[PDB]
């Protein structure tokens, strides 16, 4: 017999996960780049684009990326998104780069075995395994809502920005924060989250293209009738509904939410005719 092992997924995916150091000026007294925070990142494609977490590169005066093969680089912050806690770095390589296996047709399933790849407490790259505990998550505390993938693969400080891959090595998600110290209760065990790869892929493209995510904002938020802005100043009423935004019925609301956000600013749209603006900071 042979030893059960996910080393294949390791050989395939781990070369593409890197160490991200968030350096800042004079952290003691004299001007000099100090290491403020650690993190990980994933090399998405050969051009040198890397996804990581926004919270990891915030206030970085200098972002450095270190490949598992020894190379190091000063990376440029092409952009970030708060509402998704995603960031994209760019590095100029010439010898070629290890990129993360991505299978856009694969649909993650609850119970699929996964591997968290990252740099926990800066002990060097580590792999941990669990399963996808849940999908479509974190809607029980909606502020700047988002969709998450849940996993019991050990996520520790330093794993953010890193990769969640299946047994084949394909990217399933980007490990973000870990559910830690609930309140005063205790320490939750095996509850970790990641941004689903598809959403991370749509966000990276947006970041590469515009340096930020440009969301389509109108003005009607009440937690398809408008039950309580700058877009309602010419066409929209008060307590009425709207079968078709852009004159196309998207049955529910959540779909109209994203559809609207997916609508670039300035473009006149028939709710009446209103033009889209960019979601406020």
């Amino acid at each position: 017999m042979t030893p059960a092992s996910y080393n294949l997924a390791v050989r395939r995916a781990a070369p593409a996960v890197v160490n991200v150091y968030n350096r800042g000026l004079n952290t003691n007294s004299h001007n000099q780049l100090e290491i403020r925070t650690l993190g990980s990142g994933v090399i998405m494609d050969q051009r040198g684009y890397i996804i990581t977490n926004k919270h990891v590169i915030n206030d970085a005066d200098q972002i450095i990326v270190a490949l598992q093969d020894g190379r190091v680089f000063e990376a440029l912050l092409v952009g970030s998104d708060s509402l998704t806690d995603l960031a994209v770095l760019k590095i100029n390589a010439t010898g070629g780069l290890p990129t993360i296996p991505i299978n856009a047709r694969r649909v993650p399933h609850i119970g699929d075995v996964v591997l968290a790849i990252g740099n926990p407490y800066n002990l060097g790259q580590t792999i941990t395994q669990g399963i996808i505990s849940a999908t479509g998550r974190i809607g029980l505390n909606p502020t700047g809502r988002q969709n998450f993938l849940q996993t019991d693969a050990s996520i520790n400080h330093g794993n953010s920005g890193g990769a969640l891959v299946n047994s084949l090595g394909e990217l399933m998600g980007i490990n973000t924060l870990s559910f830690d110290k609930s309140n005063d209760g205790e320490t939750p065990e095996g509850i970790g989250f990641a941004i689903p790869f598809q959403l991370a892929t749509k966000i990276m493209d947006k970041l590469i293209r515009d340096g930020r995510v440009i969301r389509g904002y109108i003005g009607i938020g009440g937690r398809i009738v408008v039950n309580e802005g700058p877009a309602a100043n010419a066409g929209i009423q008060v307590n009425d509904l709207i079968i078709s935004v852009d004159n196309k019925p998207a049955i529910s609301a959540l779909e109209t939410m994203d559809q609207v956000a997916e609508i670039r600013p300035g473009s006149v749209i028939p709710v009446l005719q209103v033009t889209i603006q960019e979601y406020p900071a």
Binding site: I218, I220, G221, G222, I224, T256, M257, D258
Partner: peptide, 4 residues
């Protein structure tokens, strides 16, 4: 619920 919806706040878009």
């Amino acid at each position: 619920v919806y706040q878009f």
